[PDB]
Amino acid sequence: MDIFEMLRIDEGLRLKIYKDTEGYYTIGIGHLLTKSPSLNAAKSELDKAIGRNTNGVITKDEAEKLFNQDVDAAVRGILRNAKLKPVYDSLDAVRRAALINMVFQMGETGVAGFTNSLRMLQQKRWDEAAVNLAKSRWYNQTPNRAKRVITTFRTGTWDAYK
Numbered sequence: 001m002d003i004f005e006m007l008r009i010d011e012g013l014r015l016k017i018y019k020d021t022e023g024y025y026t027i028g029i030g031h032l033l034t035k036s037p038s039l040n041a042a043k044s045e046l047d048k049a050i051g052r053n054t055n056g057v058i059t060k061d062e063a064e065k066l067f068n069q070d071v072d073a074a075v076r077g078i079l080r081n082a083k084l085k086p087v088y089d090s091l092d093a094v095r096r097a098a099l100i101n102m103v104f105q106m107g108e109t110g111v112a113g114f115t116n117s118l119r120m121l122q123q124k125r126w127d128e129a130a131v132n133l134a135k136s137r138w139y140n141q142t143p144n145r146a147k148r149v150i151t152t153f154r155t156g157t158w159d160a161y162k
């Protein structure tokens with residue numbers, strides 16, 4: 001298992017524009033296109049992202065390309081963020097993947113706000129962090145995903161993705 005396979009499990013693959021769990025236009029492996037309610041605005045973002053007139057449909061290779069960029073962006077986002085970098089650097093590789101997964105889903109700013117959770121993780125108080133992480137809109141709106149990510153933080157194993 002690795003961060004790419006983990007996110008493929010959590011995000012799926014869809015080759016036509018769809019709405020994500022928040023109702024936002026998305027394509028591929030959870031590539032958010034726009035928060036605009038305009039499908040035309042989403043189609044424009046898509047064409048700009050892929051470099052061609054897609055008519056709202058892409059290939060698997062194209063979806064994987066955007067996914068690679070998106071994972072890269074989440075990691076670089078963590079490393080540039082004063083609140084996330086220390087926590088990331090304190091973690092082992094498996095738990096690092098759980099943090100990348102959160103940032104991929106919610107964005108750098110949204111995760112960096114989990115101040116109390118981040119502290120517990122930095123302290124390696126795993127059970128306490130797991131309890132604190134679940135007291136969140138995140139957990140309540142996407143509980144099965146959040147449970148998987150939290151299990152990964154709590155255990156430092158990939159058991160939740162087996």
Ligand SMILES: [Cl-]
Binds near residue numbers: 031
């Ligand atoms: Cl995403």
Ligand SMILES: [Cl-]
Binds near residue numbers: 128132
């Ligand atoms: Cl708590």
Ligand SMILES: [Cl-]
Binds near residue numbers: 141143145146
């Ligand atoms: Cl979920």
